[PDB]
Amino acid sequence: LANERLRALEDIEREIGAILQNAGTVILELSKEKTNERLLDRQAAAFTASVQHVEAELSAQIRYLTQVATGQPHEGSSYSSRKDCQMALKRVDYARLKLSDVARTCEQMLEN
Amino acid sequence: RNQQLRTLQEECDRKLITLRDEISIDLYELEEEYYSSSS
């Protein structure tokens, strides 16, 4: 559950990285002198690698979603266990109130 | 979710059953004392 969702979070961050690499590459090209042309090539390869693996991750996840889609609303649930747990907790609360009353009558008896 | 709620239910029921047994022993002592009181 955290796996595919964390993949989606990573692809969010890498879309940001793609835009920042676009911006950094045209930043270096706008310079009056741009000595680090090797670093320009590195930023260009970084940009294209970012776009390519963003495409790879999203295509893979659309494929995986195509494999496990059904168009049906999933008739499973967990309601009955929550109901039984609520009844158990209210049993405990009822016993707590009754124990408070018995202890209060014991304090009234011992108090005199 | 189901397994977690089942474990909570079982803990509550074990607490209640042990409470009932201890209260029952106390009730036995109190019944003996009250019914055998001279007054």
Binding site: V92, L99, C106 | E11, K15, I23, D26, E33
Partner: peptide
Amino acid sequence: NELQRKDALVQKHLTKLRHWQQVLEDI
């Protein structure tokens, strides 16, 4: 002696009740 015995029984019972309230509060 009946009075003192009744008070001893109720004191033991009251301590057990307070212990069980502290147990049942912690669920």
